[model samples]
Target: ALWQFRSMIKCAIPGSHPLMDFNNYGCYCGLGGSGTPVDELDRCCETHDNCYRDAKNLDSCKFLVDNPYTESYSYSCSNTEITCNSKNNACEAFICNCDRNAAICFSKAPYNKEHKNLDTKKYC
Candidate 1:
């Protein structure tokens, strides 16, 4: 068995979002936040978050490369370039792999529109 230590981060989505019911468990498109996965799709987001965190830990890039919503060190979801082929360095390779895995996971997971409205506080 392989054991990897992963520390939980705060929620990434705004507190006002309905998805915030999932708290840190909810998925965000860009950097930050990874909590206990609520389902297959949510799991993909968790993995992607961990991957980006690892890449940032190893690389010097101020922003998360290959992410469509991040343009600089500060958080901003204003970019539109989303591809896993932006590997210009070793750290980028990790980031790309993270996106690739999440992409595949999203494709394999069944989509449930209701999951988006889950109020974990009442349903969980």
Candidate 2:
């Protein structure tokens, strides 16, 4: 059988389709192509103009281009302090919370509702 791998970074465009049941989403990868894996990724990216991709791997190659979907979305984090969360040492932290509807991904560090766009609340 042909080997193919696919995954989604976020929502693959939510909603209901009459013909298909939320099956349309993400990047699809496979092996045995004429060019390198990156080449396939480039080609696929071109087709999915509305979507975006952050290359997670390349050196070893996964053999497939990113999963292409119409749109993407998500929301995140936790609050709580542990004396010894890590093996090396202990640390104190506050609960930094965000929503798929209120989170900013590429912010300067203090990601919060302030960084969100007033209109979309998605873009940082």
Candidate 3:
């Protein structure tokens, strides 16, 4: 799923560049709930949009939180402690088992570049 947050705008006006635009999903019913594409190479983006639905069958993609600490730029996963890191021009991902009896919140964000400027976290 390529969850987008921006796009390149072609204009004759000034200060024109690749602008952030994430609002284009499906049928419009007019309630302000439309947005983003989710499949491609250069035009693709990750979707943490499902990070909220904890029910149903799509709970695996849940986003818990983001942290700018724990210096590093790589992907790492664990069951006890939650820590995420990533570098530039690479794919770094983290997954945490749902701990209903645990009392902790985990999150991770880009420490360098190529993260597409987004963070992911799993709440337990």
Candidate 4:
């Protein structure tokens, strides 16, 4: 199964640019614990959540939830291109690193645990 974070960036103003909500937590932004993590991969997401929260003040971390033109614009690095390089903005690079870490964590061992499947309409 493929897992990716999907949350809209909370904007300060109605029509203003999107901004990260440091308060958001759980397996993904905007989820806020309604659905606790079910497995190690889910826990990896939680770690990524805290990572973003900790880097709230980093100037280069600017990103949007929905920009089709830019591969690294989504809040979830796994949903887009997964490249960790200098060309990425500080925040984007960090996001990539976090997701990369999650990937590593998932592949480190055999995860035989079952997980809740997402709705086809919702994810695909």
Which model scores highest in lDDT? 1
Per-candidate clashes, comma-separated: 0, 10, 18, 1
- Point out the higher-scoring one by lDDT: 2 or 4: 4
Full ranking by lDDT = 1, 4, 3, 2
The window of 10 residues in a row where model 2 has the poorest summed lDDT is: 89-98
Models sorted by TM-score, best on top: 1, 4, 3, 2
Runs of candidate 3 exceeding 4 Å displacement: 1-21, 27-47, 54-124
* Residue lDDT tens for model 4, 1-124: 0122222211111221222322232233234333555445456556755666555556544445422112353332233334345666566666656655654444342333233333323322
Candidate 1 off by > 4 Å:
1-35, 59-87, 120-124
The list of candidate 4 runs beyond 4 A from truth reads 1-38, 65-83, 117-124
Instruction: Give the alpha carbon lDDT tens digit for every residue of 5-118 in model 3.
Output: 111111111232323322221211111222332222111222222321221134333222331111123322254333334332221132211211011210121112232222
Candidate number with the higher TM-score (2 or 3) = 3
Clashing pairs in 1: none
Whole-model lDDT values for every prediction: 0.43, 0.20, 0.22, 0.40
